Amino acid sequence: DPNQYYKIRSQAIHQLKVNGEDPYPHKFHVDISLTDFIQKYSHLQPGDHLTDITLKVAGRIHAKRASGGKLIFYDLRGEGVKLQVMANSRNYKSEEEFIHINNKLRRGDIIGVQGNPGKTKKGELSIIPYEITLLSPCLHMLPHLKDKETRYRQRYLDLILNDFVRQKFIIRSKIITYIRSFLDELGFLEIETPMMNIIPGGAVAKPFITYHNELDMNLYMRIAPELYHKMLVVGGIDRVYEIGRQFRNEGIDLTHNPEFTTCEFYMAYADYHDLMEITEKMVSGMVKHITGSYKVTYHPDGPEGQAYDVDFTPPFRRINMVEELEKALGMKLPETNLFETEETRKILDDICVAKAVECPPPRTTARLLDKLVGEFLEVTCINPTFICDHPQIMSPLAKWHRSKEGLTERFELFVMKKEICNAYTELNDPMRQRQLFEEQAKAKAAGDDEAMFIDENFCTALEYGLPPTAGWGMGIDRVAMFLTDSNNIKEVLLFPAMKPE
Amino acid sequence: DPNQYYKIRSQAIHQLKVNGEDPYPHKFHVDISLTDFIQKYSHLQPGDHLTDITLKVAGRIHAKRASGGKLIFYDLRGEGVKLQVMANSRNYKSEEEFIHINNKLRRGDIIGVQGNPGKTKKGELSIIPYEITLLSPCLHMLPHLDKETRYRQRYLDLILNDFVRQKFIIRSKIITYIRSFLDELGFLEIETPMMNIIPGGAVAKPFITYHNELDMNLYMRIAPELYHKMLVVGGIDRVYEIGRQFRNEGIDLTHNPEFTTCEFYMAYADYHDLMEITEKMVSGMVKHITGSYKVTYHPDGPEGQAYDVDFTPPFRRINMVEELEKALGMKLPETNLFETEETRKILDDICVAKAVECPPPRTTARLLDKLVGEFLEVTCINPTFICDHPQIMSPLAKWHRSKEGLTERFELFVMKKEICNAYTELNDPMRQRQLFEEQAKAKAAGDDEAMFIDENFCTALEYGLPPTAGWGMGIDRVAMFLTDSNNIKEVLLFPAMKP
């Protein structure tokens, strides 16, 4: 039937071309948007007909209803709103042309309408047409009153049928525009740095690899812009930021897509204490600006589960990672430092076994700590919560803590048990940075395929003097999920990556 | 000797760590920017010393000059400005500490300075320190006063060359201006995939990459065009995206493998509407950023002559086929014959007669492109619209409503280079599928420039794309003309380099 629908409609549209009726006209001159039409003429009384006002509007037919032989109603949609077209034979250009256009049009067609504002006796705001023009026919049966995979594989159908979908992508745009205004107003320079690198850096991830033909070399898609940004701060650009795409060659799940958007910024002469204050101000201000208040309802398990109000009222709660983990475990942890050491790693491995906390190989100190933090601390972070002072073994680019041996000046911001920001006072001692890179190179050979490569170019830049600096990254897609009440990242990506069908 | 310098300074910094002197301190509390300091206190008279005001500033030492045993001047730089530090022992926290810090500091070091505004007898604005703190030593000898080093070590270029920062400020202003212009017109800023199963929307050789969990190759995008049009089918009438595109091709003065474009799509517009919007956007951008419609440009670099490029609207328009007939001095075939082998052979003969080179394949689209580059693009000094391209070179553009065989397309050229490409969008799915099938037949026959057919995109058109016009701009090339750069490496922070 839908296959039969398409064949018959394709044949009808082809016959319009043969007959010279031009079903894809080049230009229709719209006078006013549907949203403006509604705002201008909502004041009309029932039964009103403004015969002195002629306007041209356009949109998509979502319904067609005949009422006898001389009256047809079209439900015209656009911009997330709707306008009834009340087509009366007596008000049309001619009775013959009225019959002809109505027999041509179908639900789904894009049409242009020239006519007068009016309101039916039932109170429905309408345009009463003198002329309707087919602008682009719909050859398929448009669906009605869906399934998640089809919504993501044909996002244009999702946008046509589901008004809530457009609203999620408006919110996503408002988040990004808000962040640019905040950072621009603080004197940051928006920059663009390479997305293809000889050596990926700045994060822990498996990269995409590609080949450049003229230069005959493999290149990697970036996992983070962080090292380029720090080289620009060495160059004397004190405040920089970039909102752009990053790439991870891994699996797909509710919070993971192969390409995703982050904002990173770097601020000379700041430390991570300064960045916590800036983060609280930016995030709370953004939530209130976009949603109207600091409190946001969220369904962590989707509409079939319980919802919770998430409170963004500042200041945010702060916890220190190791001391809070020791309270949640009921026991003290062995101290860590820059070097992996088997005695400490075995103690943490034993703790994970006794607590039934899984950790896939390699069971390195940093990975075992990360799993323990996920099980015992991240689960308590419902309202925005800073988790602070990560061990150096987890943080190869973060500066050592100025008063806590073996820790770093780092924080992560968690909301509804998920990371949305990662930041730290930047490591700017080249000798120490080279030493941490050497530790990452060992752990890569031992089985950690996410461990960082040594970047001697970046270490050389540090030798010219990076000022004391703090940097920051935010996962834009995760923030969009929380502000749109989505628990699936596919809801906030226009064209999410999908397994082949 | 630079190697000796680095060995000696590295050992000295390692000694400071051993002695507990903390050469990379965690936090220095900057009070005021160097720029604000200069604005606030330039009014001082020579010899003034505001002993009641103390302020903290920071920056990089570019010069160090002793004057007797108790006075040292540091040239402190940052934010594109400079401030003299006039360190006399009489004002320093103590004479023993004054000797110690001055013996520690070297040109290139990042320092924090706490002190008072003042002006020397010779009238130089200065900060008179109570205390100076080493914040980050420079282990190498800082250079003073080829192009490869500037591009391979961009941070050194930024430290040494004040003009470089200004080029990237201008580049950012261009992008921010465009977003403001389109946001004000009701456009929605969107993000569409950079990794595609089928690259499309342009003629380009793509990068290919493997996704492991999906066990399939993906291509880096060459343009976002087809996704934007699907969003217009979805009912988002005005969309734009400023983002990166990728081309697996060669590098030259106007090409880099990754580059930035702005594309936008506007329902119920045609390409006449887009010419007016382009004129308003481009002329307004030039005036807002430079203060006038006229910009000086050196096409051959500073060694050559300069020309004022005039962006005052309206821009000149020329029609590709009619103007080519004038430039060649000969009638070309009627435009409804542009698909025939007879027309291809005529263009092939003309290229031979005029010594216009065209490497194989010698297709009509490629011979036309070479003729247009030789005879039309070179006349486009001021911004110039080249219009009404043949369909055979524009497979996604709508047929011209009155000129058979042409399309409703324009390209904007400035100083002989393309900066925009735009058209009334082809929205008839049967005709679009027919043009894709011709592309796929040419691709299978050996024409690598032909597009892949995109079935999902053609299916989307079957649901009804409203009449629409779309547009793309090469942001890097615009930044080149607004920074008087004739090499794209000047407007990319980290240009791709042969290793």
């Binding site: 948007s33 408002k174 525009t177 107003e185 101000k281 201000g285 | 005005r238 007016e276």
Partner: peptide, 30 residues
């Protein structure tokens, strides 16, 4: 000229983000 469409920011007033702030100081009377 193309028909008017209001900006997605609403069109009322330009966005004025809340920024970090610093408590002012009064001078030492001594």
């Amino acid at each position: 000229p193309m028909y008017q469409v209001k900006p997605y920011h609403g069109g009322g007033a330009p966005l004025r983000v809340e920024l970090p702030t610093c408590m002012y100081r009064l001078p030492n009377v001594h």
